[PDB]
Amino acid sequence: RSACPARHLNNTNGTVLKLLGCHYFCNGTLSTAPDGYPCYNLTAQQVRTLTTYPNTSCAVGVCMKGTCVKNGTMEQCFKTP
Amino acid sequence: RECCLEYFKGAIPLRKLKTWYQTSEDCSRDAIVFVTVQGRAICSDPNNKRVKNAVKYLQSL
């Protein structure tokens, strides 16, 4: 089970929805995002302080072999409720 | 809201289907999600004719 819809993080700048990290749960099992998938690379503290309000500057990246490789870009991200 | 990362490459469970919907345009991938009787959501390629026929069957009930 890996072809299920996954929770993503929202942004304020009108761009593509992105995954927190490069993994996601379906049916209780963890699956890996595909290579090239857009993701956020958050620090531990950012994950802990993430809310449904923009309050955090998230490093954008692309998934590569299960890691969120930063592309140098930053955007405000926050939980969809 | 939620987005699909992979398409279900197998046969669609027509008779277990309850409903279907379309993911947001803001998702990286276009997808049709099927929702089964027992709550499982299945991402599906909207260009696959099998997927389209499943939606047609379900909506015509």
Author numbering:
A (entry chain A): 23 to 103
B (entry chain B): 8 to 68
What does the original paper state about this entry?
Evasins are chemokine-binding proteins from tick saliva, whose application as anti-inflammatory therapeutics will require manipulation of their chemokine target selectivity. Here we describe subclass A3 evasins, which are unique to the tick genus Amblyomma and distinguished from “classical” class A1 evasins by an additional disulfide bond near the chemokine recognition interface. Structures of chemokine-bound EVA-A revealed a deep hydrophobic pocket, unique to A3 evasins, that interacts with the residue immediately following the CC motif of the chemokine.
In the EVA-A:chemokine structures, the side chain of the chemokine CC + 1 residue (Tyr in CCL7; Phe in CCL11, Leu in CCL16 and CCL17) sits in a deep hydrophobic pocket within the evasin structure, possibly enabling the ~35° rotation of the chemokine relative to its position in class A1 evasin complexes. Notably, this “CC + 1 recognition pocket” is defined by several hydrophobic side chains and by the Cys22-Cys51 disulfide bond, the fifth disulfide that distinguishes class A3 from class A1 evasins.
